[PDB]
Design a protein around this motif. Structure first.
Motif, PDB file in Angstrom:
ATOM      1  N   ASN A  19       0.862  -1.194   0.000  1.00  0.00           N
ATOM      2  CA  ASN A  19       0.000   0.000   0.000  1.00  0.00           C
ATOM      3  C   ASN A  19       0.900   1.247   0.000  1.00  0.00           C
ATOM      4  O   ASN A  19       1.625   1.447  -0.974  1.00  0.00           O
ATOM      5  CB  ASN A  19      -0.953   0.036   1.228  1.00  0.00           C
ATOM      6  CG  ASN A  19      -1.706  -1.223   1.573  1.00  0.00           C
ATOM      7  OD1 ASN A  19      -2.028  -2.054   0.724  1.00  0.00           O
ATOM      8  ND2 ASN A  19      -2.009  -1.376   2.859  1.00  0.00           N
ATOM      9  N   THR A  20       0.868   2.046   1.120  1.00  0.00           N
ATOM     10  CA  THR A  20       1.596   3.287   1.475  1.00  0.00           C
ATOM     11  C   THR A  20       2.095   4.124   0.274  1.00  0.00           C
ATOM     12  O   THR A  20       2.771   3.610  -0.621  1.00  0.00           O
ATOM     13  CB  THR A  20       2.749   2.985   2.461  1.00  0.00           C
ATOM     14  OG1 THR A  20       2.228   2.182   3.519  1.00  0.00           O
ATOM     15  CG2 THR A  20       3.376   4.245   3.065  1.00  0.00           C
ATOM     16  N   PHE A  21       1.795   5.434   0.302  1.00  0.00           N
ATOM     17  CA  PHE A  21       2.252   6.324  -0.757  1.00  0.00           C
ATOM     18  C   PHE A  21       3.759   6.605  -0.601  1.00  0.00           C
ATOM     19  O   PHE A  21       4.179   7.294   0.343  1.00  0.00           O
ATOM     20  CB  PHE A  21       1.422   7.621  -0.820  1.00  0.00           C
ATOM     21  CG  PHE A  21       1.807   8.534  -1.961  1.00  0.00           C
ATOM     22  CD1 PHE A  21       1.227   8.388  -3.214  1.00  0.00           C
ATOM     23  CD2 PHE A  21       2.767   9.525  -1.787  1.00  0.00           C
ATOM     24  CE1 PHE A  21       1.602   9.222  -4.275  1.00  0.00           C
ATOM     25  CE2 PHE A  21       3.152  10.340  -2.852  1.00  0.00           C
ATOM     26  CZ  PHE A  21       2.568  10.182  -4.087  1.00  0.00           C
ATOM     27  N   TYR A  22       4.558   6.048  -1.532  1.00  0.00           N
ATOM     28  CA  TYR A  22       6.002   6.226  -1.595  1.00  0.00           C
ATOM     29  C   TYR A  22       6.416   6.181  -3.071  1.00  0.00           C
ATOM     30  O   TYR A  22       6.331   5.132  -3.692  1.00  0.00           O
ATOM     31  CB  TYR A  22       6.713   5.163  -0.742  1.00  0.00           C
ATOM     32  CG  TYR A  22       8.215   5.305  -0.726  1.00  0.00           C
ATOM     33  CD1 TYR A  22       8.841   6.180   0.156  1.00  0.00           C
ATOM     34  CD2 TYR A  22       9.018   4.532  -1.563  1.00  0.00           C
ATOM     35  CE1 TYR A  22      10.226   6.322   0.172  1.00  0.00           C
ATOM     36  CE2 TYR A  22      10.405   4.663  -1.552  1.00  0.00           C
ATOM     37  CZ  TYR A  22      11.004   5.554  -0.678  1.00  0.00           C
ATOM     38  OH  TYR A  22      12.364   5.694  -0.643  1.00  0.00           O
ATOM     39  N   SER A  23       6.836   7.329  -3.638  1.00  0.00           N
ATOM     40  CA  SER A  23       7.146   7.434  -5.064  1.00  0.00           C
ATOM     41  C   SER A  23       8.441   6.778  -5.541  1.00  0.00           C
ATOM     42  O   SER A  23       8.490   6.329  -6.687  1.00  0.00           O
ATOM     43  CB  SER A  23       7.135   8.894  -5.496  1.00  0.00           C
ATOM     44  OG  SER A  23       5.803   9.373  -5.406  1.00  0.00           O
ATOM     45  N   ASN A  24       9.479   6.729  -4.683  1.00  0.00           N
ATOM     46  CA  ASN A  24      10.810   6.215  -5.018  1.00  0.00           C
ATOM     47  C   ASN A  24      10.881   4.674  -5.042  1.00  0.00           C
ATOM     48  O   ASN A  24      11.699   4.069  -4.351  1.00  0.00           O
ATOM     49  CB  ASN A  24      11.807   6.815  -4.015  1.00  0.00           C
ATOM     50  CG  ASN A  24      13.249   6.547  -4.305  1.00  0.00           C
ATOM     51  OD1 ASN A  24      13.697   6.576  -5.446  1.00  0.00           O
ATOM     52  ND2 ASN A  24      14.004   6.319  -3.248  1.00  0.00           N
ATOM     53  N   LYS A  25      10.021   4.061  -5.831  1.00  0.00           N
ATOM     54  CA  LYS A  25       9.864   2.602  -5.939  1.00  0.00           C
ATOM     55  C   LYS A  25      11.061   1.885  -6.575  1.00  0.00           C
ATOM     56  O   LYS A  25      11.292   0.716  -6.270  1.00  0.00           O
ATOM     57  CB  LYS A  25       8.588   2.277  -6.739  1.00  0.00           C
ATOM     58  CG  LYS A  25       7.285   2.610  -6.002  1.00  0.00           C
ATOM     59  CD  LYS A  25       6.089   2.352  -6.901  1.00  0.00           C
ATOM     60  CE  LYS A  25       4.778   2.696  -6.243  1.00  0.00           C
ATOM     61  NZ  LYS A  25       4.243   1.544  -5.476  1.00  0.00           N
ATOM     62  N   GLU A  26      11.802   2.571  -7.452  1.00  0.00           N
ATOM     63  CA  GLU A  26      12.969   2.025  -8.179  1.00  0.00           C
ATOM     64  C   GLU A  26      14.045   1.368  -7.307  1.00  0.00           C
ATOM     65  O   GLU A  26      14.845   0.562  -7.809  1.00  0.00           O
ATOM     66  CB  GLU A  26      13.612   3.094  -9.068  1.00  0.00           C
ATOM     67  CG  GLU A  26      14.376   4.163  -8.307  1.00  0.00           C
ATOM     68  CD  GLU A  26      14.984   5.243  -9.179  1.00  0.00           C
ATOM     69  OE1 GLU A  26      14.380   5.592 -10.214  1.00  0.00           O
ATOM     70  OE2 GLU A  26      16.056   5.762  -8.805  1.00  0.00           O
ATOM     71  N   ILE A  27      14.043   1.675  -6.019  1.00  0.00           N
ATOM     72  CA  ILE A  27      15.001   1.109  -5.053  1.00  0.00           C
ATOM     73  C   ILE A  27      14.828  -0.423  -4.901  1.00  0.00           C
ATOM     74  O   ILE A  27      15.745  -1.091  -4.414  1.00  0.00           O
ATOM     75  CB  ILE A  27      14.976   1.859  -3.695  1.00  0.00           C
ATOM     76  CG1 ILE A  27      13.612   1.728  -2.965  1.00  0.00           C
ATOM     77  CG2 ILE A  27      15.374   3.330  -3.893  1.00  0.00           C
ATOM     78  CD1 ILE A  27      13.540   0.706  -1.904  1.00  0.00           C
ATOM     79  N   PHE A  28      13.668  -0.988  -5.359  1.00  0.00           N
ATOM     80  CA  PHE A  28      13.440  -2.441  -5.282  1.00  0.00           C
ATOM     81  C   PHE A  28      14.569  -3.216  -6.014  1.00  0.00           C
ATOM     82  O   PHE A  28      14.983  -4.283  -5.550  1.00  0.00           O
ATOM     83  CB  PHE A  28      12.058  -2.830  -5.890  1.00  0.00           C
ATOM     84  CG  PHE A  28      12.054  -2.913  -7.400  1.00  0.00           C
ATOM     85  CD1 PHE A  28      11.865  -1.771  -8.178  1.00  0.00           C
ATOM     86  CD2 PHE A  28      12.337  -4.114  -8.051  1.00  0.00           C
ATOM     87  CE1 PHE A  28      11.883  -1.842  -9.575  1.00  0.00           C
ATOM     88  CE2 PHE A  28      12.408  -4.171  -9.450  1.00  0.00           C
ATOM     89  CZ  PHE A  28      12.159  -3.038 -10.203  1.00  0.00           C
TER      90      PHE A  28
END
Ligand SMILES: O=C(N[C@@H]1c2ccccc2-c2c(-c3cnc4ccccc4c3)cccc21)c1c(Br)cnc2[nH]cnc12
Length: 207
Positions: A19-28
């Motif tokens: 869920n949670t709003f976090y834009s910096n997803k690329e760190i996966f």
């Protein structure tokens, strides 16, 4: 196919990530490539005392495979692999303490990007994936498939697919709004920024 329940806290962290709003997803990607490098470090080190550990394959690499048709991004490694005991019990022990500390830290003001410091960087996969399938093969066990769409459970079964020799395939079934991670330009850009000094060859496959 056996179905297992996650403990409340781990299901809470997985839901937090999913869920949670976090834009910096690329760190996966940095996190999974780091888990791959750790696994390659483990088999390479074990082979130093016992060279027969590399009989299951000598090449130590990381492959990044996007598939637009299946909407998947696969992170492949030829590391140590994982046993059935790892998938069900041992890694569950790691995921328990690591979740506790990361949740404590998140409340104190830490970022979702700091997940890898708590040894649960694997869960960052759920920033971009609605489902994760892990195909793995350790020298001491059979080939297994671990899978979870989060939701409080996961499954483990023997994998009948193509034999891997040794290592781990992390298949990310991406969310429909996260297909940018299937683009060559995007993956290249992420690899350069976060994973340019990994001590193993990383091949970014194309379509
Ligand atoms: O990172 C690795 N494994 C992952 C990892 C890390 C930390 C905690 C848990 C897990 C985990 C679980 C899991 C997650 N949560 C659980 C919670 C409860 C019970 C069992 C669980 C099992 C299931 C599949 C894969 C991983 C990994 C390893 Br090692 C070896 N080679 C690799 N190559 C690339 N990645 C890896």
């Amino acid at each position: 196919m056996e179905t297992f329940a996650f403990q409340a806290e781990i299901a809470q962290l997985m839901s937090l990530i999913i869920n949670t709003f976090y834009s910096n997803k690329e760190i996966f990607l940095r996190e999974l490539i780091s888990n791959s490098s750790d696994a390659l470090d483990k088999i390479r080190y074990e082979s130093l005392t016992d060279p027969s550990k590399l009989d299951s394959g000598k090449e130590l690499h990381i492959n990044l495979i996007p598939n637009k048709q299946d909407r998947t991004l696969t992170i492949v490694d030829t590391g140590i692999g994982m046993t059935k005991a790892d998938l069900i019990n041992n890694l569950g022990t790691i995921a328990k303490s690591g979740t506790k500390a990361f949740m404590e830290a998140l409340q104190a003001g830490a970022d979702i990007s700091m997940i890898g410091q708590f040894g649960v960087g694997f869960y960052s996969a759920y920033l971009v994936a609605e489902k994760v399938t892990v195909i793995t093969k350790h020298n001491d066990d059979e080939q297994y498939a671990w899978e979870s769409s989060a939701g409080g459970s996961f499954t483990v079964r023997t994998d009948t697919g193509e034999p891997m020799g040794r290592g781990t395939k992390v298949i990310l079934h991406l969310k429909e709004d996260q297909t940018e991670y299937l683009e060559e330009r995007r993956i290249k850009e992420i690899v350069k920024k976060h994973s340019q000094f990994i001590g193993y060859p990383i091949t970014l496959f194309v379509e």
